[PDB]
Design a protein around this ligand. Structure first.
Ligand SMILES: Cc1cc2nc3c(=O)[nH]c(=O)nc-3n(C[C@H](O)[C@H](O)[C@H](O)COP(=O)(O)OP(=O)(O)OC[C@H]3O[C@@H](n4cnc5c(N)ncnc54)[C@H](O)[C@@H]3O)c2cc1C
Ligand SMILES: [Cl-]
Length: 468
């Protein structure tokens, strides 16, 4: 009984459809893109060409919604990299000491990830993906949404698709503002923080012995220094490749040519490690850039009136600067928020509004971590009324620089710090007296003077071929 319509067949649409199918009779997923039968790139998800990190916090939610997905990923070549034992990271406060594992992440191409999530989701015969279909309008009115009017791209025919619950997961380019304007709802408050960052990514084939068990490598900007923020990240993926992404805020954007890529990875960042590693490797693709960098949030939950049977989640409600890598886990967290409201209120009046409010709390931590670090860079453009970004930005940056400094050299602080950064624990968890005590205890190890690479990792950057 009861039917749901999901707008957009990306990561959020699939996760929300897996969940919704356990509460409703039928799920229909509408997407305007065409979907490949294998793990390939598609135009509906252009971000798939850049490095994608799946933090533990989101990974554990994906596992719960789609049991077995983690292993199908690992079974297909994805790497499980422990944090911080498997990262070589030059943070704004110096090198992170590689303490034993506290959290983890899954390292794979986004194309493989999306395909593995879709395939596992669509095993449920009651979910149906409707490809190459444009979303024209929401059916019903400002009081209650009753489905969506769509158009088939091939035939051009328009038809209405009924629904007791419509979920918009059309991503960052969501037409939800248009859709609800045609419904007759007021425009929602839009908050954004635009550092003006730009991405540049190339694929590489790793040295043969380094195809497995290689660490995640990152060089971070110093947000405290009044200079454009430049970063560089090297991540293993399936089939013995490395995806390498370099980024830079307004005034420090990486170039588009292959030659300038290696120099930026060498000279454009605060340490040339990533530039040194990619020179052990062979390029496979040319430079791909992207400007989809703005942290933008739509406060749908604060509207004066909200229709029953309508929910917005994923990038359509809150998108982030990708250098922190929270987007997918934020979408996962908001699917569990919808699920929790479904079990509490079923489909009674108030479900859509209660879900929209709960989704706003679900994404808040990822929204704060990104905006409070982007707001400092020179030339940053902002539109916000949030006091945490306007009034208490200086004091919140003072506590955060001391947790970050100590976490590089204190095991307890790091543990609690990476639990928050991977969205495996809430913001309040940093207020545990046991955490602030360790912060006051100070460093237990010296600050590393060189990149903390293992000899056996560096050893596998060469083959030894020309040696009798
Ligand atoms: C460069 C970059 C790097 C990133 N790195 C990370 C990372 O390391 N870790 C992480 O967790 N997140 C990362 N993200 C964020 C991540 O890509 C998104 O958070 C995630 O894709 C959210 O999924 P979604 O379903 O909301 O949107 P999408 O994944 O984009 O899915 C949207 C879907 O809706 C469809 N659609 C769009 N518009 C319409 C329309 N008008 N009508 C019908 N269908 C439509 C699209 O075809 C697509 O199928 C990164 C993003 C970028 C841009
Ligand atoms: Cl992109």
């Amino acid at each position: 009984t009861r039917s749901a319509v999901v707008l957009g067949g990306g990561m959020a649409g699939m996760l929300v459809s897996s969940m919704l199918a356990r509460h409703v009779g039928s799920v229909t997923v509408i997407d305007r893109d065409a979907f490949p039968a294998g793990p390939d790139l598609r135009k509906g998800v252009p971000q798939a060409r850049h490095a994608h990190i799946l933090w533990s916090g989101g990974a554990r939610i994906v596992e719960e919604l789609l049991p077995g997905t983690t292993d199908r990923l690992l079974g297909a070549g994805a790497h499980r990299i422990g944090i911080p034992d498997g990262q070589v990271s030059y943070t704004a406060y110096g090198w992170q000491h590689r303490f034993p594992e506290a959290q983890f992440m899954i390292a794979c191409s986004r194309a493989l990830l999306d395909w593995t999530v879709r395939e596992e989701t669509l095993r449920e015969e009651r979910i149906a993906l409707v490809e190459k279909t444009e979303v024209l309008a929401l059916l019903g009115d400002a009081g209650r949404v009753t489905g969506v009017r769509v158009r088939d791209q091939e035939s051009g025919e328009e038809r209405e698709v009924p629904a007791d619950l419509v979920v918009d997961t059309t991503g960052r380019g969501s037409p939800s503002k248009r859709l609800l304007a045609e419904l007759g709802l007021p425009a929602p408050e839009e908050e954004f923080v635009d550092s003006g960052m730009v991405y540049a990514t190339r694929l590489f084939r790793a040295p043969e012995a380094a195809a497995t068990n290689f660490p995640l490598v990152s060089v971070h900007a110093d947000h405290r220094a009044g200079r454009p923020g430049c970063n560089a990240v090297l991540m293993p993926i399936e089939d013995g490749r490395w995806i390498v992404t370099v980024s830079g805020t307004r005034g420090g954007e990486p170039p588009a040519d292959d030659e300038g890529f290696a120099r930026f990875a060498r000279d454009g960042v605060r340490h040339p490690l990533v530039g040194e590693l990619i020179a052990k490797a062979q390029p496979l693709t040319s430079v791909e850039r992207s400007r989809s960098t703005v942290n933008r949030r739509l406060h749908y939950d604060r509207l004066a009136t909200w229709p029953e049977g309508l929910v917005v989640l994923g990038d359509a409600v809150a998108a982030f600067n990708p250098v922190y890598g929270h987007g997918m886990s934020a979408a996962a967290h908001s699917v569990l928020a919808l699920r929790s409201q479904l079990g509490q209120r079923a489909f009674q009046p108030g479900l859509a509004r209660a879900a929209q409010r709960a989704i706003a709390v679900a994404v808040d931590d990822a929204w704060v971590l990104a905006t409070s670090h982007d707001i400092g860079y020179p030339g940053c453009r902002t539109q916000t009324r949030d006091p945490r970004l306007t009034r208490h930005a200086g004091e919140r940056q003072r506590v955060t620089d001391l947790v970050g400094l100590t976490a590089t050299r204190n095991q307890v602080v790091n543990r609690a710090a990476v639990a928050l950064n991977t969205l495996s624990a809430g913001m309040a968890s940093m207020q545990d007296p046991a955490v602030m005590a360790a912060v006051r205890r100070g460093p237990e190890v010296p600050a590393p003077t060189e990149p903390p690479l293992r000899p056996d990792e560096v050893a596998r950057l060469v083959s030894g071929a020309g040696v009798t």
